[PDB]
């Protein structure tokens, strides 16, 4: 179906003249392939994936290379968005990059990406259009006009529209029994007694891949969200993911209610009931 | 694969 | 502002070291050096797209390069250099891959 | 990335008009002109940016082509001071600017 592959920046300042901090991470859709990490002793672009270490030397060695100009530019970052919020140097600061492309069914390519964000906020971010920048505040404004004079919108949307879906095409078809795989859930719901005349019908989805995933709760009539409870989608670890949605019933009636499971591994929706 | 070209902020 | 070359020109004996200088004011990230014989093109020596980091170009053998200062771009002709009598010429631009803004030059001649 | 010039000398009479280009087989985000004189530094002409973008300077004239694989610098009444390398710049992908070989030109009298 559709695929995606995706990037994401972390630069984090020390007080004082402790180093930045930089951490880049590498993802084709919920898949981690590649790490950078300014504090290891390696210095280089790491694979995280076994089926990104078909690459040579000259990927890795080029991967590192340019990972380090990575680095370099949000070091000089940092220090021009303290100067733009008047901040002080004693204080932590962090910006975040992400960039990616996004296909279709048939590889083809559908979204492009290019955000920026300073302490957990917004600053600067391309728009849908691959030409536009949208600027949260007077300060990234400053950059929205210093990138619309030296035209990096073009340049990145050549990247986007272009040699990001030829990575991920790459990506894809080196390892196709990792990335092209989906594992479908392996679904179990458990009772428990609360105090006597409630009862908890919890609705169990674990081992699947993709991520995405919708746990509902019907009854009689028909999905009854609030009252139900909802966590978020947590990793397994082993590549696979887990996630449960429950619901709290009167004794007796937890034969009226069900559970319905929606993923990409499954070919209809799971309706699943608790029969005692 | 990242960009082969940076820009400060 | 602007970005200069000094001196315009320059005259060594054959195998010691030589540094050209390239400096802005134009608060340029990305600085570079190209060499251009007599009737030639240019051709990319070294380049910088942002300080404290660098990378090799089509004829980077025998030379060597410093970004620890955004505004200069210091260019040292090794003894390595098989031919190292050339015209050299430094650009910038505001960032990578954009428009590139020369210096006046430098004129080069190794002796033996 | 390559960005090739033709032609590579041109040597016409005062007056007229003439036209020198640089194609390529890639696509570029920007494309720049210069015009070096021997022995001095190359000065920026222009910056196309735009498909089918029309920018003048001067006498000189600038095309970009529709699908930025192409340009032209057209010269109007050309004149002796018109003499010098004419080249074509393009934004290369590894943070660099591809340039082509030049069009010589000398505008005679």
């Known amino acids: 179906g559709s695929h995606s592959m995706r990037y994401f920046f972390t630069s984090v300042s020390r007080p004082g003249r402790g180093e930045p901090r930089f951490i880049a991470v590498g993802y084709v859709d919920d898949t981690q392939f590649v790490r950078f990490d300014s504090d290891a002793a390696s210095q280089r672009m790491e694979p995280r994936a076994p089926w990104i270490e078909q690459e040579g030397p000259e990927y890795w060695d080029g991967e590192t290379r340019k990972v380090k100009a990575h680095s370099q530019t949000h070091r000089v970052d940092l220090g021009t968005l303290r100067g733009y919020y008047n901040q002080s140097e004693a204080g932590s600061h962090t910006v975040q990059r992400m960039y990616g492309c996004d296909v279709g069914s048939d590889w083809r390519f559908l979204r492009g990406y290019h955000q920026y964000a300073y302490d957990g906020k917004d600053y600067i971010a391309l728009k849908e259009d691959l030409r536009s920048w949208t600027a949260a505040d007077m300060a990234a404004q400053t950059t929205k006009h210093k990138w619309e004079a030296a035209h990096v919108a073009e340049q990145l949307r050549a990247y986007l529209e272009g040699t990001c879906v030829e990575w991920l095409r790459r990506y894809l078809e080196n390892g196709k029994e990792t990335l092209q795989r989906t594992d479908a859930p392996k679904t179990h719901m458990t009772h428990h007694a609360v105090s006597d005349h409630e009862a908890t019908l919890r609705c169990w989805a674990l081992s699947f891949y993709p991520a995405e995933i919708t746990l509902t709760w019907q009854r009689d009539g028909e999905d009854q969200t609030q009252d139900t409870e909802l966590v978020e989608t947590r990793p397994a670890g082993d590549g696979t993911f887990q996630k449960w949605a429950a619901v709290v019933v009167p004794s007796g009636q937890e034969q009226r209610y069900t559970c319905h499971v929606q993923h990409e591994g499954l070919p209809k929706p799971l309706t699943l009931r608790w029969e005692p | 694969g990242i960009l082969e070209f940076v820009f400060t902020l | 502002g602007g970005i200069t070359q000094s001196p315009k020109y320059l005259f060594r004996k054959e195998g010691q070291n030589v540094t050209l200088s390239c400096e802005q004011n134009?608060?340029?990230?990305?600085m570079y050096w190209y060499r251009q014989d007599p009737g030639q093109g240019l051709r990319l020596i070294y380049y910088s797209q942002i300080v404290n980091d660098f990378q090799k170009g089509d004829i980077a053998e025998g030379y060597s390069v410093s970004r620890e200062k955004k505004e200069s771009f210091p260019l040292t002709v090794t003894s390595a250099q098989k031919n190292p009598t050339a015209f050299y010429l430094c650009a910038s631009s505001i960032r990578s891959s954009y428009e590139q803004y020369f210096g006046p030059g430098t004129r080069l001649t190794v002796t033996e | 990335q390559l960005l090739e010039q033709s032609p590579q000398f041109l040597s016409i009479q005062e007056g007229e008009n003439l036209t020198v280009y640089c194609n390529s087989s890639?696509?570029?985000?920007?494309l720049q002109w210069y015009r070096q004189e021997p022995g001095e530094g190359p000065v920026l002409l222009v910056t196309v940016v735009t498909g089918g973008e029309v920018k003048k300077l001067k006498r000189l004239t600038f095309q970009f082509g529709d699908a930025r694989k192409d340009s032209s610098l057209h010269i109007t009444a050309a004149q002796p001071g018109d003499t010098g390398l004419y080249l074509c710049?393009?934004?290369?992908?590894?943070?660099?600017?591809?340039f082509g070989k030049g069009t010589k030109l000398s505008v005679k009298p």
């Open positions: 134009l608060n340029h990230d990305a």
């Open positions: 890639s696509v570029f985000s920007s």
């Open positions: 710049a393009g934004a290369g992908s590894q943070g660099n600017l591809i």
